[PDB]
Every structure is written in structure tokens, then in C-alpha cells.
Amino acid sequence: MTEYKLVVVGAGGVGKSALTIQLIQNHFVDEYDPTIEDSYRKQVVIDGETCLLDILDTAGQEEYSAMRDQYMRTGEGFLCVFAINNTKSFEDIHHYREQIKRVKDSEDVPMVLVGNKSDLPSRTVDTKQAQDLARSYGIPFIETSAKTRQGVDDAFYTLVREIRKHK
Ligand SMILES: Nc1nc2c(ncn2[C@@H]2O[C@H](COP(=O)(O)OP(=O)(O)O)[C@@H](O)[C@H]2O)c(=O)[nH]1
Ligand SMILES: *S(=O)(=O)c1cccc(S(=O)(=O)Nc2ccccc2)c1
Numbered sequence: 001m002t003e004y005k006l007v008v009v010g011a012g013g014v015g016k017s018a019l020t021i022q023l024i025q026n027h028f029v030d031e032y033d034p035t036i037e038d039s040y041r042k043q044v045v046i047d048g049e050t051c052l053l054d055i056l057d058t059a060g061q062e063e064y065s066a067m068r069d070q071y072m073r074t075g076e077g078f079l080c081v082f083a084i085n086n087t088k089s090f091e092d093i094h095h096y097r098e099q100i101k102r103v104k105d106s107e108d109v110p111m112v113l114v115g116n117k118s119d120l121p122s123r124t125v126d127t128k129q130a131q132d133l134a135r136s137y138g139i140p141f142i143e144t145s146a147k148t149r150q151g152v153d154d155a156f157y158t159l160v161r162e163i164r165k166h167k
């Protein structure tokens with residue numbers, strides 16, 4: 001069946017592991033070693049079609065590793081994640097997006113900007129700010145909460161649909 005290679009990038013602490021574990025396993029994890037990089041798998045149905053998702057959840061110390069580069073080159077779509085309560089993580093988005101364009105040597109790369117931790121009231125990044133950034137990159141912006149599951153499926157399936165159309 002059709003397989004999709006997705007990569008979740010963003011500053012440490014933004015919820016990459018929580019988002020991926022929520023999608024794959026339907027559990028919210030509040031204590032996941034931030035140094036663990038791992039690939040996750042799940043069969044899902046998207047628009048009536050069964051497909052296999054392969055998802056790389058990234059750890060900071062592997063950023064410039066050869067193995068990370070292999071996964072990035074073969075990756076087909078990228079979630080760029082920040083937390084809506086952490087301005088620094090939002091400021092960092094350009095760094096992750098720049099690395100993707102470099103490794104793929106392309107402007108036409110499926111990506112979604114993800115604003116996570118939407119269930120937290122102490123917001124510091126406005127949705128309008130993130131939509132403007134998303135617009136400037138030509139990508140969708142999806143609000144998520146790994147805790148409540150808000151937008152989790154939407155974020156990953158939107159990326160899959162982007163890849164599906166890109167193919
Ligand atoms: N309230 C809330 N906490 C979250 C959310 N996503 C992640 N977290 C928490 O943020 C911390 C870091 O998340 P983690 O998945 O380890 O981030 P990573 O470093 O990007 O993998 C953990 O304490 C998680 O419980 C969310 O959507 N809502
Ligand atoms: S890894 O051990 O090279 C690995 C584990 C599971 C799946 C894959 S993959 O062939 O599907 N490549 C990939 C690339 C980007 C994001 C996820 C998976 C590789």
C-alpha cells in the first residue's frame with residue numbers, strides 16, 4: 001500500500017514526540033526523553049485509502065548527523081513545529097525550514113507549520129503571526145494540541161495530502 005515518509009522537526013520541547021506518539025498510539029506522553037530520535041509507523045485511512053505512515057521524531061543532538069541527513073533526503077513531507085507558548089520556538093522555525101530546503105535542494109517541498117500546545121492559555125505567539133509566516137512559506141498552518149488531540153490528525157493528514165498531490 002502507499003507509504004509516506006514524514007519528518008517532525010522543531011526546537012526541543014515543542015511537542016514533537018508528544019504529537020507523534022499521540023498520532024501513532026492515541027496516548028499523550030508527558031515524559032519522553034528529549035534525546036531519543038525514533039521512527040514510528042501506523043496504518044491509517046486518509047480519504048478512504050489505506051496508507052502506511054513512517055514518521056521520524058527528531059532529537060536535537062542528531063540535527064547534523066549523517067543518519068539524520070539520510071532520513072531528511074528520503075523524507076517526503078515535514079512538520080515544522082513550534083509551541084504557541086514559546087516565542088523562541090517560533091523564532092526558530094526559519095532555521096528548520098531552511099535546513100529542509102537545503103537537504104531537498106527544492107522550493108517545492110511538502111510542509112506544514114504546526115502551532116502546538118494550543119490547550120495552554122499562556123500564549124505568546126498569535127495565530128495571525130503564524131498564518132503570516134505560513135503564507136510567506138507557501139504552506140498551511142495547523143493548530144494542534146498533543147494533549148487534547150486537537151488538530152493532530154489534521155496536521156499529519158494535511159501533510160500526507162500535500163505529498164499525495166506532489167506525487
Ligand atoms: N499542555 C501540553 N503539553 C504538551 C503538548 N505537547 C507536548 N507537551 C509537553 O511538552 C513537553 C515536551 O514535549 P516533547 O514531546 O518531549 O517535545 P519534543 O522535545 O519536541 O519531543 C512535555 O512535558 C510534554 O508533555 C501539548 O499539546 N499540550
Ligand atoms: S531507519 O532505521 O532508516 C527507518 C526506520 C523506519 C522507516 C524508515 S523509511 O524507509 O520509511 N525512511 C523515512 C524517512 C523519513 C521519515 C521517516 C522514514 C527508515
Ligand SMILES: [Mg+2]
Pocket residue numbers: 016017018032033034035036057058059
Ligand atoms: Mg522528543
